[PDB]
Structure formats: C-alpha cells, structure tokens
Design brief:
The structure is cut from a larger assembly and holds 2 copies of chain A. With about 55 residues, the first copy, chain A, is mostly loops. It is classed as viral protein.
Chain lengths: ~55, ~110
Amino acid sequence: GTGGRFLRLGGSGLSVGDIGGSNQITIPTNALPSHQHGIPANTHTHSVNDGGHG
Amino acid sequence: TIISLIPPTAPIPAGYLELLNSSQNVSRTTYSALFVLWGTYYGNGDGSTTFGVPGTGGRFLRLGGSGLSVGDIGGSNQITIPTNALPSHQHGIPANTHTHSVNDGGHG
C-alpha cells in the first residue's frame, strides 16, 4: 500500500517495499542551538533586626 | 526509466539496466542507443570503451524545474537548527533567598 508516502530510491541498504520515516518530527535535546538569555535589572533591600546594644 | 516493485529474488526485465546506490560504468558498444542518448553525462567510465550511469543511494524521487537540471543531487537527512532560527522564550527564575554578613567591628 502506498500509504500516502514519498517515492524513495533505496540503493543504500534499503530493500524494495521498505517503509519508515515520519511526518511528525521531535527536536532532540542535543539539537538545541546554543543561546544566552538576558537577566533583567534587579533591585532589593534587606531589613535589619536589632534589639539594641549597651 | 521505469519503476518496479521487483523483489531481489525476481529477475531483471529484459532490455533494462538496474540502477544502484553507486554510479556504475557500462560498455559503450552495448547499450549503444542509451549511450548516444546520454554520452558521458553521468560519468565517463574508462573514457573510451565505457560510460557512466548515475547511482541512487537512498535518495528520494523529485521532479524537475525551478532551475534544477536533470540528474542533479543534493539534500540531507541530518538537520542542524541554525542558532538564528529558535523559538523566542524566557525561562523562569526559581525563588531564592540570600543574606549578607555584617562587617561591624566596634564603635564608641
């Protein structure tokens, strides 16, 4: 059955009638290109606790 | 060319040359019509007594046009996503907590 597939000559280790391939593709983890995210401007303070000192 | 679902056990049809993964070389005297129609367009073989016929290694069938000549080659099953093409995204930053030690010494 054709199965709505593409016509592929199979010289390299592919007998006649061989199937395979996939219309759905999944990006593997190692395929992700290198990229760098920017961290926005930040600002904070710390409250200070003290009962006193003699 | 013609296409066939012939299993490897079955014999090749008479008057037909089987294309393989690798480009082959065939005698010029025989397949005389094929040679005069092709010549050394897909290989020259020995250059005098043979000529080259193209090979199809795992390749897909694609029609001509768009400036592409017959018998051209190209493509790849392996793809690398260019760093330019990448879905725009932002990661969240996990909740954290830090304190700073105090350099107080002493005062009077």
